[PDB]
Design an enzyme around this catalytic site. Structure first.
Site, PDB file in Angstrom:
ATOM      1  N   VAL A   1    -122.847 -17.969 -73.598  1.00 37.97           N
ATOM      2  CA  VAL A   1    -124.206 -18.494 -73.551  1.00 37.97           C
ATOM      3  C   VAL A   1    -124.977 -17.943 -72.343  1.00 37.97           C
ATOM      4  CG1 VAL A   1    -123.645 -20.635 -74.795  1.00 37.97           C
ATOM      5  CG2 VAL A   1    -123.531 -20.625 -72.283  1.00 37.97           C
TER       6      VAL A   1
ATOM      7  N   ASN B   1    -124.421 -27.369 -75.549  1.00 39.75           N
ATOM      8  CA  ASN B   1    -123.347 -28.233 -75.116  1.00 39.75           C
ATOM      9  C   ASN B   1    -122.313 -27.494 -74.282  1.00 39.75           C
ATOM     10  OD1 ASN B   1    -121.171 -30.593 -75.561  1.00 39.75           O
ATOM     11  ND2 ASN B   1    -120.267 -28.658 -76.251  1.00 39.75           N
TER      12      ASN B   1
ATOM     13  N   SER C   1    -125.862 -35.212 -68.236  1.00 37.73           N
ATOM     14  CA  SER C   1    -124.750 -36.069 -67.824  1.00 37.73           C
ATOM     15  C   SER C   1    -125.236 -37.282 -67.032  1.00 37.73           C
ATOM     16  CB  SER C   1    -123.746 -35.305 -66.980  1.00 37.73           C
ATOM     17  OG  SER C   1    -122.730 -36.196 -66.575  1.00 37.73           O
TER      18      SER C   1
ATOM     19  N   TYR D   1    -122.614 -28.995 -60.388  1.00 32.50           N
ATOM     20  CA  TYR D   1    -122.675 -29.620 -61.699  1.00 32.50           C
ATOM     21  C   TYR D   1    -123.862 -30.571 -61.820  1.00 32.50           C
ATOM     22  CZ  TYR D   1    -120.845 -31.580 -66.048  1.00 32.50           C
ATOM     23  OH  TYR D   1    -120.688 -31.983 -67.361  1.00 32.50           O
TER      24      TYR D   1
ATOM     25  N   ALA E   1    -126.627 -30.365 -59.964  1.00 35.77           N
ATOM     26  CA  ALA E   1    -127.826 -29.523 -59.917  1.00 35.77           C
ATOM     27  C   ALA E   1    -128.183 -29.052 -61.333  1.00 35.77           C
ATOM     28  CB  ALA E   1    -127.610 -28.330 -59.009  1.00 35.77           C
TER      29      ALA E   1
ATOM     30  N   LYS F   1    -127.152 -30.299 -64.309  1.00 35.91           N
ATOM     31  CA  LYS F   1    -127.379 -31.229 -65.326  1.00 35.91           C
ATOM     32  C   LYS F   1    -128.719 -32.019 -65.094  1.00 35.91           C
ATOM     33  CE  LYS F   1    -124.386 -29.506 -68.482  1.00 35.91           C
ATOM     34  NZ  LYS F   1    -125.235 -28.353 -69.222  1.00 35.91           N
TER      35      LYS F   1
ATOM     36  N   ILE G   1    -116.141 -39.323 -70.825  1.00 33.80           N
ATOM     37  CA  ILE G   1    -115.731 -39.092 -72.212  1.00 33.80           C
ATOM     38  C   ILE G   1    -114.352 -38.493 -72.201  1.00 33.80           C
ATOM     39  CG2 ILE G   1    -116.342 -38.061 -74.458  1.00 33.80           C
ATOM     40  CD1 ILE G   1    -118.480 -40.050 -73.387  1.00 33.80           C
TER      41      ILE G   1
HETATM   42  N1  LIG Z   1    -116.873 -34.998 -71.300  1.00 30.68           N
HETATM   43  C1  LIG Z   1    -117.484 -35.618 -70.187  1.00 30.68           C
HETATM   44  O1  LIG Z   1    -116.840 -36.358 -69.488  1.00 30.68           O
HETATM   45  C2  LIG Z   1    -118.950 -35.369 -69.913  1.00 30.68           C
HETATM   46  C3  LIG Z   1    -119.549 -36.121 -69.120  1.00 30.68           C
HETATM   47  C4  LIG Z   1    -120.767 -36.000 -68.847  1.00 30.68           C
HETATM   48  C5  LIG Z   1    -121.596 -34.990 -69.417  1.00 30.68           C
HETATM   49  N2  LIG Z   1    -120.918 -34.040 -70.407  1.00 30.68           N
HETATM   50  C6  LIG Z   1    -121.565 -32.972 -71.061  1.00 30.68           C
HETATM   51  O2  LIG Z   1    -120.957 -32.639 -72.391  1.00 30.68           O
HETATM   52  C7  LIG Z   1    -120.771 -31.117 -72.370  1.00 30.68           C
HETATM   53  C8  LIG Z   1    -119.427 -30.745 -72.907  1.00 30.68           C
HETATM   54  O3  LIG Z   1    -118.388 -31.435 -72.176  1.00 30.68           O
HETATM   55  P1  LIG Z   1    -116.844 -31.384 -72.562  1.00 30.68           P
HETATM   56  O4  LIG Z   1    -116.205 -32.587 -71.926  1.00 30.68           O
HETATM   57  O5  LIG Z   1    -116.650 -31.417 -74.068  1.00 30.68           O
HETATM   58  O6  LIG Z   1    -116.075 -30.065 -71.962  1.00 30.68           O
HETATM   59  P2  LIG Z   1    -115.033 -29.150 -72.782  1.00 30.68           P
HETATM   60  O7  LIG Z   1    -114.297 -28.297 -71.805  1.00 30.68           O
HETATM   61  O8  LIG Z   1    -114.088 -30.025 -73.559  1.00 30.68           O
HETATM   62  O9  LIG Z   1    -115.777 -28.112 -73.758  1.00 30.68           O
HETATM   63  C9  LIG Z   1    -116.541 -27.021 -73.226  1.00 30.68           C
HETATM   64  C10 LIG Z   1    -116.478 -25.919 -74.211  1.00 30.68           C
HETATM   65  O10 LIG Z   1    -117.542 -24.937 -73.829  1.00 30.68           O
HETATM   66  C11 LIG Z   1    -116.831 -23.673 -73.855  1.00 30.68           C
HETATM   67  N3  LIG Z   1    -117.484 -22.802 -73.007  1.00 30.68           N
HETATM   68  C12 LIG Z   1    -117.501 -22.656 -71.799  1.00 30.68           C
HETATM   69  N4  LIG Z   1    -118.111 -21.908 -71.308  1.00 30.68           N
HETATM   70  C13 LIG Z   1    -118.801 -21.204 -71.983  1.00 30.68           C
HETATM   71  C14 LIG Z   1    -119.840 -20.028 -72.121  1.00 30.68           C
HETATM   72  N5  LIG Z   1    -120.312 -19.360 -70.982  1.00 30.68           N
HETATM   73  N6  LIG Z   1    -120.281 -19.671 -73.439  1.00 30.68           N
HETATM   74  C15 LIG Z   1    -119.815 -20.310 -74.402  1.00 30.68           C
HETATM   75  N7  LIG Z   1    -119.048 -21.189 -74.443  1.00 30.68           N
HETATM   76  C16 LIG Z   1    -118.489 -21.734 -73.506  1.00 30.68           C
HETATM   77  C17 LIG Z   1    -115.442 -23.982 -73.467  1.00 30.68           C
HETATM   78  O11 LIG Z   1    -114.588 -22.869 -73.840  1.00 30.68           O
HETATM   79  C18 LIG Z   1    -115.171 -25.234 -74.175  1.00 30.68           C
HETATM   80  O12 LIG Z   1    -114.628 -25.053 -75.535  1.00 30.68           O
HETATM   81  C19 LIG Z   1    -120.913 -30.661 -71.000  1.00 30.68           C
HETATM   82  O13 LIG Z   1    -121.855 -29.535 -70.904  1.00 30.68           O
HETATM   83  C20 LIG Z   1    -121.399 -31.799 -70.201  1.00 30.68           C
HETATM   84  O14 LIG Z   1    -122.659 -31.479 -69.534  1.00 30.68           O
HETATM   85  C21 LIG Z   1    -119.539 -34.378 -70.545  1.00 30.68           C
END
Ligand SMILES: NC(=O)c1ccc[n+]([C@@H]2O[C@H](COP(=O)([O-])OP(=O)(O)OC[C@H]3O[C@@H](n4cnc5c(N)ncnc54)[C@H](O)[C@@H]3O)[C@@H](O)[C@H]2O)c1
Ligand SMILES: NC(=O)c1ccc[n+]([C@@H]2O[C@H](COP(=O)([O-])OP(=O)(O)OC[C@H]3O[C@@H](n4cnc5c(N)ncnc54)[C@H](O)[C@@H]3O)[C@@H](O)[C@H]2O)c1
Ligand SMILES: NC(=O)c1ccc[n+]([C@@H]2O[C@H](COP(=O)([O-])OP(=O)(O)OC[C@H]3O[C@@H](n4cnc5c(N)ncnc54)[C@H](O)[C@@H]3O)[C@@H](O)[C@H]2O)c1
Ligand SMILES: NC(=O)c1ccc[n+]([C@@H]2O[C@H](COP(=O)([O-])OP(=O)(O)OC[C@H]3O[C@@H](n4cnc5c(N)ncnc54)[C@H](O)[C@@H]3O)[C@@H](O)[C@H]2O)c1
Lengths: 253, 253, 253, 253
Positions: free
Chosen positions: A59, A85, A146, A159, A161, A163, A192
């Protein structure tokens, strides 16, 4: 079938989101760096009788993202939804001090990396799909923020900054794209149960639950359902907002 | 059936939300001061194959609210959902000066009346169903705020105090009730064409739309489906939040 | 001499603020229900070479507020600053369930009384002073909110409603009164060592400091100097805002 | 003499802030790229009998920032205050369209340059002074945000991302640094009469004043004064907050 691009789809919240959109009848285009997990996702959606493609896309790479959108449009002729995402973490104090000097500090690269994926990635993907949405007089832009983007959090300079920055870009694009039938919203998840959280030590997890009014760590499904709601053709009057899905948790001092 | 109490059900957003929840298969209890419109709602619900009751209830009167909740329990045994939607407006500048004299000011009574219905009524209603939600270890509390509760607005000292405070109470109750399986959220609507708004001058409505990025006045139906989604049994990780449904409109100064 | 009205001046934050403003060269008019502490305040201000009057005023009572503003106009011909700091607390859970029954609940009168002083009182005082600020084309309105108005808090339905609602009115009034030379702002204090606080269990006070980044309970003079700053004739471009003075404390859930 | 670093000190808000701190008795170390303007500022401070150094520092360059801090500590032995005020703009729509055809879009280097200075630079500078403030058990970190980081703004994807992100970073650092006697706050200026605004067309400026409750464009001195207050050794209980100095202006959509 409306077409939905979900970045970071191969794992966690994006995996759940991808599955939910497919079951809802969207044709899902799944983006991630993780090719094996990508194919696994497609196997999962085929087993559930859905329609979806996987593509290896960074991305944060403009050329990669542009090529990816062109292929979708050439094949399917439309992008109805983009869920931004994809994310990464590299936590650490700005400066960590013990005994009269700095034992560690947040590496410039660690900062840049998290901003590149979590902030600049959102900008690139949205910029790439937008012209198609404009020409179609329709679209749904959905950005992963987030709870931590609202209150800050210890050890999360880069992170946070990104979000909080994503909410800001969401407010801009709301204003710019509304007049073309496009809505732009963010979601702000709490704790999560994706892999990072599920690996946390026992004492830390149960304190995290104790700090959460509803009484649990959230499930990726909770967020996936939230993205699906915001993406609805019936959610045309929802734009420029940040929907918190955090079990009521507020990050104390 | 799950039972949903919708206050101010007789017109506008309340009416659409009542029609909406009953169509989704909830048993609706509609509370309103307006008996004629309330009855007609019930009729329309019953003709569409739904189930609903109406009761004349002044949400600002504790005795009225308590009796009506007791009736529901006696009849149906449960309150799954409360939508605190009843409200009134009586706008006016704090003070209006001319000829070196005050010529008009927001009357104490008109301050008080909007507080009573829009703030105190939300307190009384929630307080009355809360114990039943606790015993059943399940609940959905949903409170009517306003975009104007976020930004403030000229001429609305009273309405803004109420609507900002409703968000405050939403945050408290989320803290107090989460431990019992109850979530507590608010919706903050933007411009929505109810009766009064529909009767506003054409020129004014045009300027309101011009200030709205998605490019229209909102519909009661936009709100009705938002409550429905937040009220879902699958929306249990959403709590303590304020969902904006304003078409991206920010009330500028 | 600029004239400053400080409500709830007999104690805590209000007392420090009156002392502070009088030392800076304002003529202070201290309002409070408590005459004993009130009259002593004036004696002390006078001792220090400053200028101040005291009036017994119930800020929740319209007639008593009107008469007292009139008396100040008759004596001094002007009001430059009004600090709405008068407040009361009566905490409690919305409902308290045990044995399958409600054993305690926030009484209607508990809810009402806090709303009356902490929200209505701010409305009445500001409404009464406003025309004189308008005629003079100058004014500073300063409203006591709370950190708990931003985040909500367990057991504080009433107090949070009023303090979040005070922020709402602050935004209205900024909009209405700016064109007349008047700024309208709020302060949201965190933990401050007034009476009730100084008397809290040592172990509880220790917990509260631990939750506070800068590592202490605040002092009333932290707040008094913040009002003075906002009140400055060189602070005319600050309006419609909420200044947080909370040592970085965020009220976790 | 406390030592204050003011970044972007050569013009606009930075210049006024540098002058205001010098007049308060701070030894000012002014940082900027603009060397001639840097020398003129020093000459202005000298004329007013103040103490100050100028250095050519690019806040976005880690090596340059750390070399500059090391020179301050070697020369003066302390850094009491950092004002991260340096910034740049490069506005434009994400996607500009006419004829269902894209005529312009925000260039990637345009996005990157603004993030680099307005976001990363803040991170580099703070990170560079922080160990010295920790050692000394004292510090004031003060970050330039904008009213636009609160509400979003048409054509400001990159700038809003930065300024909303800076607020996020402010919240992280408050949490991490408070225990060492260090506070971290942001200021969010409204419309301020620096060169860019001053060059705006007559009709746009008029409407900007009209939309500002207090009835004017802000002055750089408005913001200088606010930074000075926040940096006071008496402001140790102000931390983690964003002070708006915007004349009551809220950015309508
Ligand atoms: N899970 C949480 O606790 C939480 C909390 C607060 C906010 N969020 C938000 O939800 C989103 C996803 O969180 P998550 O917990 O599922 O993490 P996750 O690691 O489970 O999933 C992230 C996915 O993005 C992929 N990825 C990474 N970098 C990349 C790039 N440059 N191009 C393409 N793909 C790419 C990874 O390979 C992975 O499959 C986050 O961006 C976050 O801002 C999550
Ligand atoms: N419609 C909008 O443009 C808009 C915008 C922002 C916020 N809101 C809000 O959402 C809510 C619904 O707004 P609406 O536009 O549908 O107004 P509405 O006038 O159409 O309906 C309000 C209903 O509440 C009823 N009601 C009033 N007072 C009452 C009392 N004391 N007890 C019981 N019932 C009572 C009325 O009889 C009426 O049927 C309002 O409370 C308001 O806070 C509306
Ligand atoms: N002190 C804190 O911890 C704290 C924290 C957050 C917010 N605040 C706010 O700042 C204000 C001051 O709080 P405090 O800690 O100094 O409490 P305090 O009890 O020490 O002072 C309250 C004062 O207001 C006066 N008062 C009360 N009721 C009144 C009425 N009807 N008319 C006139 N005067 C009246 C009381 O006599 C008393 O002197 C409060 O309004 C509070 O909402 C305080
Ligand atoms: N003045 C307004 O209208 C307004 C409104 C809101 C916010 N702001 C904010 O406050 C701050 C000041 O704005 P301004 O209007 O005073 O700007 P300005 O353009 O007047 O001054 C910015 C200064 O930063 C310097 N600078 C730029 N890049 C640099 C680098 N890489 N390293 C070091 N120095 C560099 C410039 O040379 C210049 O002197 C900005 O960061 C901006 O975010 C200003």
């Amino acid at each position: 079938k409306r077409v939905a691009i979900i970045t970071g789809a191969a794992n966690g919240i994006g995996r759940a989101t991808a599955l939910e959109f497919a079951q809802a009848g969207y044709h899902v285009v799944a983006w991630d760096l993780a090719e094996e997990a990508g194919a696994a996702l497609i196997a999962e959606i085929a087993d559930a009788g859905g329609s979806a493609d996987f593509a290896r896309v960074d991305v944060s790479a403009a050329e990669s993202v542009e090529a990816a959108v062109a292929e979708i449009i050439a094949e399917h002729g439309r992008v109805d939804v983009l869920v931004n995402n994809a994310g990464i973490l590299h936590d650490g104090q700005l400066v960590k001090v013990k005994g009269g000097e700095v034992v560690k500090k947040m590496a410039e690269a660690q900062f840049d990396a998290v901003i590149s994926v979590n902030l600049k990635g959102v900008f690139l993907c949205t910029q790439a799909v937008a012209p198609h949405m404009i020409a179609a007089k329709y679209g749904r832009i959905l950005n992963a923020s987030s709870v931590v983007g609202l209150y800050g959090n210890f050890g999360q300079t880069n992170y946070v900054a990104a979000k909080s920055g994503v909410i800001g870009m969401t407010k801009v694009w709301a204003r710019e794209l509304g007049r073309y039938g496009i809505t732009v919203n963010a979601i702000a998840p709490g704790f999560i149960a994706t892999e990072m959280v599920q690996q946390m030590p026992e004492r830390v997890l149960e304190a995290m639950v104790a700090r959460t009014p509803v009484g649990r760590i959230g499930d990726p499904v909770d967020i996936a359902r939230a993205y699906l709601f915001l993406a609805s053709e019936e959610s045309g009057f929802i734009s420029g907002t940040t929907l918190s899905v955090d079990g009521g948790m507020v990050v104390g001092s």
